[PDB]
Subunit: 123 residues, 4 copies
């Protein structure tokens, strides 16, 4: 699914996920968030299962963005964990965790959780 994953994806919020899937299982690219303390593109990196099951299962993957670029630093990082589902209407279905750097006293409220669905076509 190197070819299937590589490309430009869009989530339900209007964020843009630009990714290349390497033959070795690497994910590289850029993320631009339509929401939050974010401007322009941020580096991402991750991994995917480069030899998925041949039984109709999805392809497991995940990636991270730290929310620092040349424009802004939100002192936070999001990880997306999910699976790629191929076909006519290909999708990456994810859940995510966004951790902010906090003091120890505020660490209980450090992490947001959500879910993003990416498609090859904008909404």
């Amino acid at each position: 699914d190197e070819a299937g994953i590589t490309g430009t994806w869009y989530n339900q919020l209007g964020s843009t996920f630009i990714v290349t899937a390497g033959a070795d299982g690497a994910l590289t690219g850029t993320y631009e968030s339509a929401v939050g303390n974010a401007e322009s593109r941020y580096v991402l990196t991750g991994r995917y299962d480069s030899a998925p099951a041949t039984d109709g299962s999805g392809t497991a993957l995940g990636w991270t963005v730290a929310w620092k670029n040349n424009y802004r630093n939100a002192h936070s990082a999001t990880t997306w964990s999910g699976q790629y589902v191929g076909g006519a209407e290909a999708r990456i279905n994810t859940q995510w965790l966004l951790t902010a750097g906090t003091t120890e006293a505020n660490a209980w409220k450090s992490t947001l959780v959500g879910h993003d669905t990416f498609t090859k076509v904008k909404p």
Copy 2:
């Protein structure tokens, strides 16, 4: 916190997280899980905030492992999202999401969630 994050970390389960923090915000290394459908080391890659706040907050970071190596393939990927807290008892406090590749019918039960705490000394 490049020097502080770079090195060998151990979680509460006895897993080993070997990481290098790059000047550019990259995380690269290997993970060895003490539990689950896993043997030996797996590639990891992620990101950290390379210019964190100077107010005593932690340093946000995250990384991904896809559970495929030369020995085994669990058709799954884990992402850790958390923060590095420096000092005498340095720690990385994380929450994680483990997504397995599934059929669409089983996608509701695709993703496990948990929390791991890493220290520079083994338990």
Copy 3:
């Protein structure tokens, strides 16, 4: 939103959530899962914000089902945490945690997480 929340709701899997919202903030009712080690209805209880903000924000709520009834016991419990959004196409948007009883050795894989969206029409 007592009136708005009380009733029968359906999620994207075809599960059925039957709830009464009490004036005091209680949620009581039954849940029937279309998936998993489940059959028929299970008791639920939870809570909701009975005096929500007047600024167009949703209404926070949550509830629990332990997956034991007279038919089956899956030795697990799910909690839904979310908000009610009123209007012509009312919805309850949730994220959930399903914890199974495990040995200590297996506790790292005890808990599934997911998200369910409920509407008043199937």
Copy 4:
């Protein structure tokens, strides 16, 4: 585990969870948070497995608090999902989701996730 669960529990933050476990699987009681937009006690309700496995497994349970009482209203609700592990040093190990009421535009940042461990003795 009716007897084992019923009573007063304390988490790592100093919060107090006062619960009665009913023969029918009900959980009832009060919660007092040591942190956040909270003062005094809040109603809780939930459920537990009243016929757990006899194989050394924990006892699944969960409960909800809506953060409204006579003193304050944080327009939010937390659910704890976890298991009771009996014995000397009995514990309830949980993960939680805190959802705030939000506008639709802010719904992506509505929900915090974390983990709390409760014991029968205070920290």
